[PDB]
């Protein structure tokens, strides 16, 4: 699941 809480995508 990709997540972007702060401007950057990570898994």
């Amino acid at each position, epitope marked *: *699941q*990709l*997540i*972007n*809480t*702060n*401007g*950057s*995508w990570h*898994i």
Partner: antibody
Amino acid sequence: EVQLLESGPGLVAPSQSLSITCTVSGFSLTSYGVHWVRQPPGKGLEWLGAIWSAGNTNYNSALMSRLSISRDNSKSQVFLKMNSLQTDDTAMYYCACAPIYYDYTWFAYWGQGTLVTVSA
Amino acid sequence: EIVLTQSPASLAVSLGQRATISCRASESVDNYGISFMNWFQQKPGQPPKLLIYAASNQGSGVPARFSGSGSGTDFSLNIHPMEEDDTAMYFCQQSKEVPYTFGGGTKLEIKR
């Protein structure tokens, strides 16, 4: 029901500042990024910046020094402030949202937009 | 940053034919095995509507005749068969990294 609504000044004199409020309902700001996009009349979309779910911000490269974005989670409000507007800043100003996931709600909900005319 | 070059600037397509719009990025918009390329439709007097996310996935309320494709730096939106309500502005957008950026837009009209 995800909803966004812009409130802006309509008319701004050149060199004066712009303040727009995006009021949201149907989601919490701590779970979404809220993005600002503008569109000069008859021209293209321009990403101005965002306040991410974590509460940090990022901005358009060329306009960053004139732009400030903030939020008030308790009031479900996101704010755009822009300095010293000139005629080039005449545009429709939108807020839009996207969750922390990349899915079909990506920029799927927008406000109707508020038109800002820069003129004396 | 990642500059998106959208082509054509404008075109008209007759009913039932194919409209092809392209978006080329100055560098890859791929990461984690997917392409962060989005497409929007905008009708007069309306905010944009999401058509396509992740290069090829269709948004809610998006007819099958809208198809996105591509990877890396080269992407396309195909509309076929073209219908009357498809006259609109179309924009690509990359969301791989900040700043997010838009293509310059395509004005697509009906030839009749």
